[PDB]
């Protein structure tokens, strides 16, 4: 659920994820890791709860 973003192995090889799928795999990654602790734009060092 961490939405870990792969690339294939060694540099310059055929296999890797995408630039395109680079995003939103990476961005939604922010949100979730954020969204629990952050709630919105900003994270809470004191934490965040959801009613």
């Amino acid at each position: 659920m961490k939405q870990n973003i792969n690339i294939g192995n060694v540099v310059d090889d055929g296999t890797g994820d995408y630039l395109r799928k680079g995003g939103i795999k990476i961005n939604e990654n922010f949100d979730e890791l954020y969204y629990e602790l952050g709630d919105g734009d900003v994270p809470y060092s004191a934490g965040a709860w959801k009613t």
Binding site: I7, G8, N9, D12, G16, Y18, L19
Partner: protein
Amino acid sequence: VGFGFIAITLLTMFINVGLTLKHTETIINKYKNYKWDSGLPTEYADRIA
């Protein structure tokens, strides 16, 4: 003579669908896919927004 006969009639229709059908033309494209998983090295720069 001496005989009648009975006559049913019919018709057929001869129509080209296919002559119209064809392939018009085929094309293709050249792309550079961004997969990450690369270094730069050859050349540089070039296209710049």
